[PDB]
Structure formats: C-alpha cells, structure tokens
C-alpha cells in the first residue's frame, strides 16, 4: 500500500527515484522524515516531509531506515512506540547488527520484524547492488516483498548477515572506485587529445559493456580480458603499466579497509 523512508539522504532519494520508474510503488504512496534538494526534488515527485519520526510509522506499512549508524541507536527508542508487529523495518545503515534493531524494539512490543541490507547509491538508474538477511521474526512473505522491491532496483539476494560487512566494501564503496577510475581515464583522454565530455562518455559505456559482459556471460573476468588483448596489440602494453604499480593490489586492500573499519566502528 504505502512505503516510508525515515531518511532523506542520497540513499533515500535513490530508492524513491528508482522505485518510481518500474512502478512497483507510485510516488503518491510515500512518507518521509529541508534545505538540501533531496527533500525538495523528492517533493517535486510528491514526497511528504513529516519532520517527525513518529508521524510516519503508522502511515508507513514498511519502513526503511536510511539514517546514519550513529543516529539509528537513539532512533529505535523514538519509533518503537509506533513500531508494531504489522510493520516491516529494514535497516539500510551499515554496521548495525540485527540484534541491535531487534533487541531494542523488543522492549516496546514482541515479535519485531527487521531486515539488514546494503544497497548502493547507483540505484537511481535502476542498476544498483543490494543484499539482505532475514531476521528472526522476518517471515518468508516479508522477504519476498523486499527482494521484489529491490530487484526492480538491481541485484538483490539473500546473504547471511556475517557477510554484509564484506559486501559493504565491494557493493557500497564500490561505485566510488569507478568514479575515481573514470576520472583518471577521462583525465587520460585530454592528455592524449580527447574532449573532457567525450572522455567521460566513451569510458563510461566501456565500463558498462565490461560489467554487463561479465554478468550475463559467466566467463572468468580474465578470460574476457584475454579475448580483448590481440597478440602484439596496444592493450597488452597498457596492461603492463597497470600491474607494474599494482593495479590489482590497490583495489584488493581497498575493500579490506572498507570492511575492517565498518567492524571497528560498529564496536560501539
């Protein structure tokens, strides 16, 4: 019937701007919780600024917790009065254990339904990556709706919550790597004589075509790289410069640090 996003950050608008295109839920049935354009642009779509956390729970059948990990512990005390066994709560905040959202909302009422997820920000273009873990009192029907809700958003599967911290470094911090990568590539286009906008547009579809090829064609990523490299070609000379500076090594210890700190920060 109606979904509600307590948050208003980039993630909140990303879900709303991604839910509206597929039409699983329209822009009329939504409740939120006012200087940034995220609320104003969503207000152009019809998002309601309740400005009170409790003023949205009873109006939101399923609630998404888009608040920050430091805001979410005290948030549970303010909404648990309006949390009910009918309401499906989905915590989008990283490092938030399912116990924290279930044990805190256990005091207000029994049988709390919660789900932990890690959806990316490139869901505005309907191609994000997310995973979820079913809570204790989260039934099969509750998870079937969530996947269907975020499968319109992109890749959505059921992983166990002990692996969502590692997905954070690969699916959550991942898109930032391509932004910096597509910057350096575009910065290489100008140095070799390409316009800035064309250097952004040419490389962007090259990353789409490389990612889309690996997804549907289940060949190993290196095998797809080997078929591109023609013997005695320009591609093999360029790949040498990447592996000399440890191109693979940097991206490897990057995901490690993103997952390591998320565990350290959650220890609070």
UniProtKB/Swiss-Prot annotation:
NADP(+) binds at residues 6-11, 53, 66-69, 92-94. L-proline binds at residues 161, 234-235. The keyword Phosphoprotein applies. Signal peptide: none annotated. It is an enzyme of class 1 (oxidoreductase). One of its GO terms (biological process) is cellular response to oxidative stress. Keywords: Acetylation, Amino-acid biosynthesis, Cytoplasm, Disease variant, Leukodystrophy, Mitochondrion, NADP, Oxidoreductase, Phosphoprotein, Proline biosynthesis. Disulfide bonds: none annotated. Detected in erythrocytes (at protein level). Expressed in fetal brain. Its main location: cytoplasm. NADPH binds at residues 8, 10-11, 53, 67-68, 94, 227. It catalyses: L-proline + NADP(+) = (S)-1-pyrroline-5-carboxylate + NADPH + 2 H(+); L-proline + NAD(+) = (S)-1-pyrroline-5-carboxylate + NADH + 2 H(+). Pathway: Amino-acid biosynthesis; L-proline biosynthesis; L-proline from L-glutamate 5-semialdehyde: step 1/1. It is linked to Leukodystrophy, hypomyelinating, 10: An autosomal recessive neurologic disorder characterized by postnatal microcephaly, severely delayed psychomotor development, hypomyelination, and reduced cerebral white-matter volume. Oxidoreductase that catalyzes the last step in proline biosynthesis, which corresponds to the reduction of pyrroline-5-carboxylate to L-proline using NAD(P)H. At physiologic concentrations, has higher specific activity in the presence of NADH. Involved in cellular response to oxidative stress. In some cell types, such as erythrocytes, its primary function may be the generation of NADP(+). This is Pyrroline-5-carboxylate reductase 2. It comes from Homo sapiens. The lineage of its organism: Eukaryota, Metazoa, Chordata, Craniata, Vertebrata. The gene is PYCR2.
